[PDB]
Design a protein around this ligand. Structure first.
Ligand code: LB8
Length: 339
């Protein structure tokens, strides 16, 4: 029983959606699609509807479309955005040319919230706990976010948090030195670097490392954490990067307690464990949840891992119509979650 659809124009964009979804109004537009808020007549809840921009125009657009649907269909966790619905007005593979994605509608993001003023220590404990609980889940499936920043963390009035990616404040301000500079092997803990930058900003009300470019960014980071020692220099394979590092005048590591003055000492200790250059030594999400800073919230019996995720498609080079047929299969096979 294919539902009945209706059509309108919003900010120069045409939208065709089932009658289930009423009173659409624009929230935001980005590189890869635009979002509206809607009322879901079947649940009586507000939702977000994303219409992908030219989803099958090139091989790269088609693979990105497939990737976003595969990731959204996987996510079943309280602190990660989830898929409530996916539809197309198309009746056949042949007509298939538009993809719409439906999630919960959140109240605000942490960019909005910190721009107002800095947060209390109790609010920081609860927000960073929920981020790490979400990251333990996605990291357990070998999924890396890679673009964490305050605008990708969405909250309701009761402070319940979900990690999302809107797909665009500079990304470089939150990016791990090893992935920004390609200077060492990189794992899930690029995301723990971003969390440390975000937690500092929620506590102080100030961007920790507001670099103008990749060179200025590295200079601001090294002023806090210190120039690499001989033991970390051993692990850098890029001769360009090592030459550049060793061509700078040495800087000592600062005492974080002398930078974040009058913060909770357990908050300062956790920032010292997150903002380390050596990606082998940086704290994991699972280890961070057991840290004393989270004593009020930590429950080792309610921090679940994910089902395994098949990311073998990431290594494939296919034609537009192949990525399009794969995406069609995932729309057809979608099972909605419990009401
Ligand atoms: C409809 C929709 C569709 C797709 C996504 C989305 O996160 N896609 C990701 C998926 C994969 C990610 C992997 C790493 C972990 C996180 C997921 C992507 N880019 O591929 C989000 C929304 N929803 C929203 O994006 C949404 C839901 N409230 N709000 C919202 C936020 C703040 C204030 C008001 C509304 C928004 C928005 F950002 F637009 F404004």
């Amino acid at each position: 029983e294919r539902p009945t659809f209706y059509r309108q124009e919003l900010n120069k964009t045409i939208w065709e959606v089932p009658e289930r979804y009423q009173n659409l109004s624009p929230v935001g537009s980005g590189a890869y699609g635009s979002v509206c808020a809607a009322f879901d007549t079947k649940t009586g809840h507000r939702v977000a509807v994303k219409k992908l921009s030219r989803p099958f125009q090139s091989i790269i657009h088609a693979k990105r479309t497939y990737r976003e649907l595969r990731l959204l269909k996987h996510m079943k966790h309280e602190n990660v955005i989830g898929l409530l619905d996916v539809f197309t007005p198309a009746r056949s593979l042949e007509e298939f040319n538009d993809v719409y994605l439906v999630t919960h509608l959140m109240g605000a993001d942490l960019n909005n919230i910190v721009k107002c003023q800095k947060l209390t220590d109790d609010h920081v404990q609860f927000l960073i706990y929920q981020i790490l609980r979400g990251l333990k889940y996605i990291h357990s499936a070998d999924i890396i976010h890679r673009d964490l920043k305050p605008s990708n963390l969405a909250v309701n009035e009761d402070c319940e948090l979900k990690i999302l990616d809107f797909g665009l404040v500079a990304t470089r301000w939150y990016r791990a030195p090893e992935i920004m500079l390609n200077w060492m092997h990189y794992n899930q803990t690029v995301d723990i670097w971003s969390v440390g930058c975000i937690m500092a900003e929620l506590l102080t009300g100030r961007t920790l490392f507001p670099g103008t470019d990749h060179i200025d960014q590295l200079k601001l980071i090294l002023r806090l954490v210190g120039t690499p020692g001989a033991e970390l220099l051993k692990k850098i394979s890029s001769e360009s990067a090592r030459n550049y590092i060793q061509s700078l005048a040495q800087m000592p590591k600062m005492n974080f307690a002398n930078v974040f003055i009058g913060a909770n000492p357990l908050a300062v200790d956790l920032l010292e464990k997150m903002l380390v250059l050596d990606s082998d030594k940086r704290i994991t999400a699972a280890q961070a949840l057991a840290h004393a800073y989270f004593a009020q919230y930590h429950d080792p019996d309610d921090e679940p891992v994910a089902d395994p995720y098949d990311q073998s498609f990431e290594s494939r080079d296919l034609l537009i119509d192949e990525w399009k047929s794969l995406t069609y299969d995932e729309v057809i096979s979608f099972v909605p979650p419990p009401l």
